[PDB]
Amino acid sequence: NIKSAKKRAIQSEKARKHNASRRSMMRTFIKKVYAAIEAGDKAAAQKAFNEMQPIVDRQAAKGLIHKNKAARHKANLTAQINKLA
Amino acid sequence: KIRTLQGRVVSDKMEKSIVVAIERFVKHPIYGKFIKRTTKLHVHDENNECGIGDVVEIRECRPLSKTKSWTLVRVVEKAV
Amino acid sequence: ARYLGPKLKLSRREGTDLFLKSGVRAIDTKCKIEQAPGQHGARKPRLSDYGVQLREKQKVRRIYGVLERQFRNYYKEAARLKGNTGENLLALLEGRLDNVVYRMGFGATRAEARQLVSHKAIMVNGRVVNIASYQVSPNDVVSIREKAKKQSRVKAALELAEQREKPTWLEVDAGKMEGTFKRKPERSDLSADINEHLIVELYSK
Amino acid sequence: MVTIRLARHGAKKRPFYQVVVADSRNARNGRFIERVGFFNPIASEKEEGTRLDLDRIAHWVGQGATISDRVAALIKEVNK
RNA sequence: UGAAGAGUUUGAUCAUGGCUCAGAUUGAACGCUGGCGGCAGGCCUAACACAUGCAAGUCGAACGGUAACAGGAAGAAGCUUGCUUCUUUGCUGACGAGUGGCGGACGGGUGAGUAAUGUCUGGGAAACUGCCUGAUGGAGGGGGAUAACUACUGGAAACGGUAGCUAAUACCGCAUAACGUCGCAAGACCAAAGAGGGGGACCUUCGGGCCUCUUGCCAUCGGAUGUGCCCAGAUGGGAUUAGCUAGUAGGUGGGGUAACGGCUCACCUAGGCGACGAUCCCUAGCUGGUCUGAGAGGAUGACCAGCCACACUGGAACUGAGACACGGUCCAGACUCCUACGGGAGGCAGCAGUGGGGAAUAUUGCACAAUGGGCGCAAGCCUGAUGCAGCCAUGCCGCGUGUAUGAAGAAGGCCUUCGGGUUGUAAAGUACUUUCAGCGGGGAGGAAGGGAGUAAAGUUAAUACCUUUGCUCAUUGACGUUACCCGCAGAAGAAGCACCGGCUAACUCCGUGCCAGCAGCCGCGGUAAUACGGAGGGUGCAAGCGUUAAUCGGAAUUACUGGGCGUAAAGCGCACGCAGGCGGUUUGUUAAGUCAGAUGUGAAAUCCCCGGGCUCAACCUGGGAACUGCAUCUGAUACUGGC
Lengths: 85, 80, 205, 80
Prior knowledge:
Chain A has 85 residues and is mainly alpha-helical. Chain A has six helices and no strands. In chain A, helix 4 (42-49) runs antiparallel to helix 6 (69-82). Chain A is elongated. The termini of chain A are far apart. The relative contact order of chain A is 0.11. Chain B has 80 residues and is an all-beta fold. Chain B has no helices and seven strands. Chain B has strands spanning 4-11, 17-23, 26-27, 34-35, 38-44, 55-65, 68-77. In chain B, strand 6 and strand 7 (68-77) form a beta hairpin. With 205 residues, chain C is α+β, with helices and mostly antiparallel strands. Chain C folds into two domains: 7-93 and 190-204, Ribosomal protein S4/S9, N-terminal domain (Ribosomal Protein S4 Delta 41, Chain A, domain 1, Orthogonal Bundle); 94-180, Roll (Structural Genomics Hypothetical 15.5 Kd Protein In mrcA-pckA Intergenic Region, Chain A), CATH 3.10.290.10. Helix content of chain C is 34%, strand content 7%. Chain C has helices at 8-13, 49-62, 68-78, 85-93, 97-103, 110-118, 152-161, 187-190, and strands at 122-124, 127-128, 140-144, 178-181. The two termini of chain C are 25 Å apart. The structure holds one RNA strand of 643 nucleotides. Chain A: One of its GO terms (molecular function) is ornithine decarboxylase inhibitor activity.
């Protein structure tokens, strides 16, 4: 009949067209930092790092990745730019 | 510390671990005679200097690997 | 259950008058009482001790009218707090409401008293009680209700009791048909100080 | 979710009604944290009605538990 | 601290030895019989499938709309012609669905799977919390669809596909950035909504503004129960079951979560488990407890309290504080009902009913009145939960089936020192009295909040609205022939079943003649059979009696307590070596064994022991014991262990 499954069958796709859209968007802004370590310059990579944090903060301040995953992604990429010459 | 024991090494085939044998020291619950009863622990050791047949001192901790909830403290006696 | 049928057979097996059909038919017997239970006993006598132990098991409970399950249930309260079971059991059987109403004189037998207790006529501590499985408290009141005081059977029960001796462990005012139960009796004051070696081993195994 | 409540005890014909501090998880009268007294509907020869421990209820009300209305006025008439 | 022993090999007699029994426990079973009140118990089998009906709904004090009732308005002026009808309209109290929200993960059912890193006890470190109930702040304004409804296209229809309308405390941005987070840093990031009532001064389409009471939104830190994760120590049986393990055991680089971890991907190693029993098979859910017995040690984990796992079967996903999700989704399998031929939809190991599988296991019960839980600011709604009746000897408990009168024994029978005896005072007929049931008249308590009043400097703007603990009044009941009280009739509605040579209480007449039969054991049965048949009499339990089974006992018959091996089972032909078991005579050290004293934990229930109430006990319970332990300190130091 109805219960909660009938609503969840349409509203979970409306969520997959908003929340999972931003999951994939954030993962693309992360992938674009692993290109900027091939620009021959440390300041061009630091430019692309502060181009990636503003979407990681949007998922951290909203409370989806705030327990460790935001601090893990920020630290992991901070090490890749502190590794450059 | 919560638990701290001494025992004897039986396997040294590991680069961050050893296997240690310890005694129960127990009265048999119906036949009344005392028994040694040997039980095994897989123990954390990142120095890799203690070896087989040596006597070691070990302490209980939070899990470090599967079946690995103890870590090395001292080498008590050297068996050569 | 309880026993039903011919009554003289009961007084014949108990070797004693039971107040059953015991008017002018009791005078100088001629009724097989103290003589002939059954018809045999003198020609092939077995004299078995299991048979006397079985006879004691009937004898000790039929006087109080209580059945086997009831008797072993009182024995359960006599066998706790060490032995001496015959004296500790006596205090329980003598504390029954059918036994106390019989000792107050309102019945010619414990069964006649038990049948007056069932007929809603008896009250204890100021309220009506219709069970004989009750136990009377010391210095508590037992009384008969007004609509039973003039009954010809009860009149004849108090008329029998006033021709006999008094039990000292209770008192009743015949001008009110009311009074108090003082204490549970003692086996050496109710009869005599003697040992009965069967009753201290009775029931179980 | 902890509350102070008058619990169903002894059910049929002659109930006793104990008063308890308990968590709202699962069952109506399952697990409890502290049992603090009894309402007891029987006054027959006894002064053992409406009893409550005034140290234990004060250790929960407004400091970890809520109070049920069927106890919220009982606390002012304890064995009165 | 509690205390069952006996029978049978033989000419036997003492030993030894198999077999068998009296008892207690049970949700038990067959059969005969079965009266009245109470407490408990009533598919441990196929984890087999289910007709009919019902089980988790709720909110108009967010609101697009209007199923319903009575009103307000507007029409037809109705026939149903003297009433207040018919038809519309959300105006209003309201509310059949729709949007939206809270909760659906609990309350019930069950033992198939599982010898388990499952579960219990006792600890531990890396881990959770929507709601409930506090605490500090915010409390501005927009943008974008759609169900209901109306049509198009197919169907008889549940309902698929497709165009159109439209509301929000729903949905998503911007500003703000808190009691949140980050970089040396300009900074970079996450919100939100009102709503119902009332009123002083003034304005007013006197609804609106403004103020204020009640109650909502958003963020962050608490309060406190409980959930995840891991480690000792234990769990049914087994070795004429010996091997089993490539994510198994270990390393080295990268990832995932609220956290642990071979949780997970890759590159390398040969480890790990196993005789203190791995592999594998049958059996079995775990604990509190229950419970046999002298006790040990097992057995047993239906009921009540707490865990595990299952939801016809397998495997996933969506959502949330919480799900490998009873009665949800979704795919596939096995089985079934409906068809107008489009195909569609299911699963009672819930509550009541029904068929299989069996030795064998409730009504197709009354109501939501109260109480719990869900929703509701609240009156209320929901409930096979729960109250509260029935059916069934299955156990236990209270209580029955009445009294008087009646013969040197009527009539019959049974046995005849043939004299008498005896069933039996029993019967006939004659008179008395009723517990329990049947049937009447009276009749509680579970009832309070709620409706009205009164009061409270109630929160305010003190006694408007509203609202609350008491008080004054009218009231709310399924059960019900109830609890309890008094009567109306009549012995009326009521007694079985083995047992009687000996163990084992009851006696020994005739018939049969090793047959017919009996039987637990010993043994009985060929011309008086104390044992069969047939008897009359006699004993014992009793709404039970006989006949069995499960699990124990007797059983020391697996031996700790507590054995057997010269010859009554078995000393292995002898010496060598050996994991394990035992170890001189002393001092010093340690406190693992042991022992002492503290702090905890062994939930509630329960045996035992002491008090109280139900008419007694059971039951409902106030208290003390106990769960001999397992942890965290402190302490003795004799002896075993260790140094």
